[PDB]
Amino acid sequence: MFGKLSLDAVPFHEPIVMVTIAGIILGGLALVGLITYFGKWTYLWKEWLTSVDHKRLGIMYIIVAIVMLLRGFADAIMMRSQQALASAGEAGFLPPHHYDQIFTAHGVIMIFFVAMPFVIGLMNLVVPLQIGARDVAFPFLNNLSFWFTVVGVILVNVSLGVGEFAQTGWLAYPPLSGIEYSPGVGVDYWIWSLQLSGIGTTLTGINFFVTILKMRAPGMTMFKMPVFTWASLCANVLIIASFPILTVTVALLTLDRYLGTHFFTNDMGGNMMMYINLIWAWGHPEVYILILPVFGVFSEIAATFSRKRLFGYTSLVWATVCITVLSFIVWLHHFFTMGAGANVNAFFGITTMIIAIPTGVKIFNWLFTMYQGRIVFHSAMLWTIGFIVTFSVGGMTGVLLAVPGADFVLHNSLFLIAHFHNVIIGGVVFGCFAGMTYWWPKAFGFKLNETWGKRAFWFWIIGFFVAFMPLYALGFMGMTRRLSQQIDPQFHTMLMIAASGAVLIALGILCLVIQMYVSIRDRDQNRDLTGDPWGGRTLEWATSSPPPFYNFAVVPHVHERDAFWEMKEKGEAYKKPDHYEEIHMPKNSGAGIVIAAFSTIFGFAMIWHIWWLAIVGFAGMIITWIVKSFDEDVDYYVPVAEIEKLENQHFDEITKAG
Amino acid sequence: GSVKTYMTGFILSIILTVIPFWMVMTGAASPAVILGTILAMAVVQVLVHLVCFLHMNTKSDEGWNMTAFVFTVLIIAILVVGSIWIMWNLNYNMMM
Amino acid sequence: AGGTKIFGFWIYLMSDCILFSILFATYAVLVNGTAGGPTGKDIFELPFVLVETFLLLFSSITYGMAAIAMYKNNKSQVISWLALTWLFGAGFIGMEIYEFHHLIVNGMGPDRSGFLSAFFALVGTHGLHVTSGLIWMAVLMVQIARRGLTSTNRTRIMCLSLFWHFLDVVWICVFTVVYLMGAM
Amino acid sequence: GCNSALLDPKGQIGLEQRSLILTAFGLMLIVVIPAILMAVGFAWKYRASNKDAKYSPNWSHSNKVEAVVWTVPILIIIFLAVLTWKTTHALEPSKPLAHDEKPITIEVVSMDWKWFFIYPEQGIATVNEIAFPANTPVYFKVTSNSVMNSFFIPRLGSQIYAMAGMQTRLHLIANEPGTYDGISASYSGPGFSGMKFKAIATPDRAAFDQWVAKAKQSPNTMSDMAAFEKLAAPSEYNQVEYFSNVKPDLFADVINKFMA
Ligand code: HEO
Ligand code: HEM
Numbered sequence A: 001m002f003g004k005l006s007l008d009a010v011p012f013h014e015p016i017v018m019v020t021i022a023g024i025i026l027g028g029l030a031l032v033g034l035i036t037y038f039g040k041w042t043y044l045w046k047e048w049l050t051s052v053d054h055k056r057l058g059i060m061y062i063i064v065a066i067v068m069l070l071r072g073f074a075d076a077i078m079m080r081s082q083q084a085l086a087s088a089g090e091a092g093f094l095p096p097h098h099y100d101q102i103f104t105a106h107g108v109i110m111i112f113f114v115a116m117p118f119v120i121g122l123m124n125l126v127v128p129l130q131i132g133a134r135d136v137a138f139p140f141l142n143n144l145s146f147w148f149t150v151v152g153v154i155l156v157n158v159s160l161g162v163g164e165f166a167q168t169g170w171l172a173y174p175p176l177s178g179i180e181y182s183p184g185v186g187v188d189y190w191i192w193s194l195q196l197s198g199i200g201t202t203l204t205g206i207n208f209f210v211t212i213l214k215m216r217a218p219g220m221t222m223f224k225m226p227v228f229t230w231a232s233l234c235a236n237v238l239i240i241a242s243f244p245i246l247t248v249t250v251a252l253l254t255l256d257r258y259l260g261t262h263f264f265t266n267d268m269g270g271n272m273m274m275y276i277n278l279i280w281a282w283g284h285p286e287v288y289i290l291i292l293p294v295f296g297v298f299s300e301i302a303a304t305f306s307r308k309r310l311f312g313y314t315s316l317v318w319a320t321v322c323i324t325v326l327s328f329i330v331w332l333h334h335f336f337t338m339g340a341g342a343n344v345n346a347f348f349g350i351t352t353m354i355i356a357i358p359t360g361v362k363i364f365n366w367l368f369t370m371y372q373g374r375i376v377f378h379s380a381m382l383w384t385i386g387f388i389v390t391f392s393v394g395g396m397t398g399v400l401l402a403v404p405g406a407d408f409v410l411h412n413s414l415f416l417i418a419h420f421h422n423v424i425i426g427g428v429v430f431g432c433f434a435g436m437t438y439w440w441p442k443a444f445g446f447k448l449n450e451t452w453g454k455r456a457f458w459f460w461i462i463g464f465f466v467a468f469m470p471l472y473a474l475g476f477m478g479m480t481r482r483l484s485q486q487i488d489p490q491f492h493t494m495l496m497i498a499a500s501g502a503v504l505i506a507l508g509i510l511c512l513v514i515q516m517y518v519s520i521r522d523r524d525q526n527r528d529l530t531g532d533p534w535g536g537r538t539l540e541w542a543t544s545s546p547p548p549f550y551n552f553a554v555v556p557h558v559h560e561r562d563a564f565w566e567m568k569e570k571g572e573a574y575k576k577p578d579h580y581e582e583i584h585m586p587k588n589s590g591a592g593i594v595i596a597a598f599s600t601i602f603g604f605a606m607i608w609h610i611w612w613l614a615i616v617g618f619a620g621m622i623i624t625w626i627v628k629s630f631d632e633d634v635d636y637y638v639p640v641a642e643i644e645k646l647e648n649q650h651f652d653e654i655t656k657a658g
Numbered sequence B: 001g002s003v004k005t006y007m008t009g010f011i012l013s014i015i016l017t018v019i020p021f022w023m024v025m026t027g028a029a030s031p032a033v034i035l036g037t038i039l040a041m042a043v044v045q046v047l048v049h050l051v052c053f054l055h056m057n058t059k060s061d062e063g064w065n066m067t068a069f070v071f072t073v074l075i076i077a078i079l080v081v082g083s084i085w086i087m088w089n090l091n092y093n094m095m096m
Numbered sequence C: 001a002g003g004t005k006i007f008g009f010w011i012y013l014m015s016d017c018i019l020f021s022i023l024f025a026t027y028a029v030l031v032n033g034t035a036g037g038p039t040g041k042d043i044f045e046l047p048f049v050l051v052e053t054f055l056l057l058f059s060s061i062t063y064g065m066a067a068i069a070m071y072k073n074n075k076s077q078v079i080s081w082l083a084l085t086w087l088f089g090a091g092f093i094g095m096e097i098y099e100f101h102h103l104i105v106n107g108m109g110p111d112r113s114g115f116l117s118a119f120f121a122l123v124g125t126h127g128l129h130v131t132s133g134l135i136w137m138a139v140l141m142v143q144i145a146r147r148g149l150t151s152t153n154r155t156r157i158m159c160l161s162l163f164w165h166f167l168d169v170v171w172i173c174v175f176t177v178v179y180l181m182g183a184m
Numbered sequence D: 001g002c003n004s005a006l007l008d009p010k011g012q013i014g015l016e017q018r019s020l021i022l023t024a025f026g027l028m029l030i031v032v033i034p035a036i037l038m039a040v041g042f043a044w045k046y047r048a049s050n051k052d053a054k055y056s057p058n059w060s061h062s063n064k065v066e067a068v069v070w071t072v073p074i075l076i077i078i079f080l081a082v083l084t085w086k087t088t089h090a091l092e093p094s095k096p097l098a099h100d101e102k103p104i105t106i107e108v109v110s111m112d113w114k115w116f117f118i119y120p121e122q123g124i125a126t127v128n129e130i131a132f133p134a135n136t137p138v139y140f141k142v143t144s145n146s147v148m149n150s151f152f153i154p155r156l157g158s159q160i161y162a163m164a165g166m167q168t169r170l171h172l173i174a175n176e177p178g179t180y181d182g183i184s185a186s187y188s189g190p191g192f193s194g195m196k197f198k199a200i201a202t203p204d205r206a207a208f209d210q211w212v213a214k215a216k217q218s219p220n221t222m223s224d225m226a227a228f229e230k231l232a233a234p235s236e237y238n239q240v241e242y243f244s245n246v247k248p249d250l251f252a253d254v255i256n257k258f259m260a
């Protein structure tokens, strides 16, 4: 109502943004109408929105990541179509003013709100189950982290509705993203979205790091955990040691933009290059945060579907620890073209090359896990094989790019985009879909349709090759990134092929949606009765396919590496305990959503320079936190009756199915 | 910990704060010495604060009070030294 | 239960160590940033920094005495020591605010040079950390006065001890690097 | 692409960079190709359907296999890292080329959505075009009047950044006379697509002197900072322009605009 906000902040004239806003608002209105009609408001509030259960927060991360993937891929389609039309000597349909917004928003969404939400969803879903714990160390902290991520997502989406988004790339390099050269409010949207998302992610990292070390099942030493728990611990260590760098960097840029300081300005002795260093000091650990958990997932799948013990457990854990250690001394490999001395460039090139060895070791351990096993061609196993094949080429191109000599001409070219898209699609989203199809029974109690899954996998891999292999050739031809208008016609053909690839990936995404739909429709015929659909090695498969809000009635005792496999081999897998005991559990808290709403108001007011509203929002956040610090009734006791009833129902299911 | 260790830490902190301040305000030595000695006294005071006041011990949390702190010190020694070195090189290579 | 919360707060303090190390590196890069403006030697008053350091050290010692009294299962002693610690912290924040006001009024604000911007950023970050500690002490004292020394209260006191001693260590590093070394 | 800009370069630096790319490609192939081949081989040969395939559900560790897995990557990284050190120390843009002919100094100021070039020795100025005789070293001193940009001629060789108030050095030599495309490799804003220029490697010196004389005939002059700022106005898809008279120290003044 005050500040820069006015009737001119909404783009009336531009049709594309208005039809996008109409689509989003009608979708929201239809969802609200359906929820009201079914009267599930109370159930959603008391079971999902205020849930402190790790499984619910994991599923809700998966939902957020899936719904944001649609917006990301829509931006990808729009960019590819614009490039294809511009290559044919046409004006196209996307002015630079819109193309810059589109690619910046696409990058930010697909990095911060598609990959991290899905990966952290998988962690919340399985990590507490695998270690044999009932919940996480800080449940309310997990809920608050979820709501902070949702606040970031809301700010990014509402950026389209009112005002504009950043036009400075997904990392907002200082001189362009400065107050002098970017007078718009888009950079403020970027700043506050990433700040609040970073706060959420830091809290998540601390929570998981404490949970893994402190709340392990008795008799399970560090070198007896499942490999996914190792990868998650490494990723959380990276989050804790990295995200402060992003927080400080964005805080310095917003100080420059608001109070008119000279941290990164080109004048009054500001050092602009500093920002780049800092952001990349945070930038390169981030990608390992995306790639470490998915490795674990594949390891788990390699264990489950090869029907044999995983190869080189010690080698795998030492390789992931080596990756975690080396992922802090390699960031300069992002700007060899900045003009640093031969010594610094050579050193950073060599150290970036060194980290390749552990990844190769992990790939070879997976290959020898498939060596003399019985391989079942399930959806997850197809995802794993596709991941290995794609990620090998991705890593090859990466180590080629890590050489400063090659980097001097392949930097910011479509070769670099081919690299990072190649490795992301190969590892991150492949592991995401593999985990989603692999852990679906543990989240809902029924299996996914295999035919649609296989179709989606084939479409994804074929489309990815067709869309990104021409980008290698284009990068070789000298075509640079972020080109919108009057593209050299010599780059037309390859881009057209890329466009074909894009629509192929589209079909894959459509296939995925259809799969979920049919998986929901035919749930009554594909139920997971025994709780062990694929004979998984880890403890997570010991529980019923719908896990109780308490993960285990009795905390399991572990003596070996693969706990559940050893329990099945010994013949003691489903034994009725003599007696059940009252279980201490944490209560559902509603303060997370209140703090999230106050943070949303504060961020929005900061973006539009509504000072009083920002003060009100910040005061609301602090007051809600202080008030929730008072009450002591935060935990309750689950009685013996309910635990006995659920355990008897599960054992009856086991007996009838068995 | 006891009152005795806190009082000892307090006395050592008073000494390690007074000496550098008095040395700098008077220019009692060569600038190289006035830098090296104050950095040494600063790190000694940091260790005294960690031991006496923060009860920095190995046994607590089955050895994750040592490991976490040493790991973060290694990360700081990487990040700060790396940034300083990179910017020194990047500033030396753009002079006219 | 207290163990997990204390370990979590320790990991958060390690994250905050990384946060402050980034600001230290930024200041070290932009230490000579100032162009046609005040330098370290021109504006840094060493007596003021010495008084600030002694008052924050007094705050740390008083809070330590509060922790010992809490181990002694006494409420009044803990309340008195917490009040003295909060008074010392308030004095320190007062001096920092006075220094910032004096710098801004004299046309030497964070918008004048890179060096001044970095100095303001680092000392301001420490200031907001100390004022967060002060608000935490206020809420903790008002909780103790109405709840007594419970397990949750003991856990919160241990976490605030870790936070306050960490802030004192950070201030030691700050006055060593920024104030004392600059005025050399 | 066989006839690509990088795989068929015309400059020397391009030639060593292409050789380095091919050597690196060859070294990484020896490990990558077996990984994919073994992936497909183990997927097919050891499927659940096969009965004759040897089943080992307990073989989970092997010292020989682990040693073989660890060794080959280490050796490949050692060889390619030695090559990386040698090439990086031998392909620094901030390093004068070894050649008999004296280098020609070109100053590259990067205005918003256009390219500005100054020949101080020849005392001329150009917008979106350069020229230099073939088989002659060219010494680029690159700076940005504004937001970061990236000077890049794909066929000739290595790229560099242009940043405000900072001079960055680059060296390029053309082995074959002709016209080469030059772009910006750093997104500077809406007009970033606009940034495009042509490098003309003349067959002989005489053609270069003729081009310099033609530029000298331009009615427009760049003698004062006011004219420089008038040209520095935000404009998009700027045409090739010439300026006869240039201030002796214009690059220095452009850098000192930011007091650095
Ligand atoms: C999934 C995400 C992710 C991950 C994990 C990686 C990890 C790697 N990245 Fe890609 N990166 C990813 C996505 C990106 N990287 C980037 C930046 C980037 C840059 C700097 C950009 C530039 O110079 O212009 C280089 C050189 C590479 C190469 C590599 C290398 C060598 C690794 C290594 O850490 C791992 C590589 C994997 C290997 C090596 C496995 C293959 C090996 C096999 C079986 C063993 C064979 C043995 C040998 C080859 C010796 N990354 C950017 C920034 C984009 C931007 O600028 O905005 C993104 C998004
Ligand atoms: C699903 C298929 C995908 C397609 C077709 C796609 C397509 C594109 C395209 C065309 C660009 C612009 C490249 C250019 O400048 O010419 C781009 C940029 C980018 N994409 Fe994607 N993308 C996809 C998935 C992803 C995913 C999953 C992520 C993140 C994990 C991602 C992260 C990025 C980033 C960081 C950029 C750079 C943004 C910038 O330059 O500022 N992409 N993508």
Ligand SMILES: [Cu+2]
Pocket (backbone or CB within 6 Å): A283, A284, A331, A333, A334
């Ligand atoms: Cu990188």
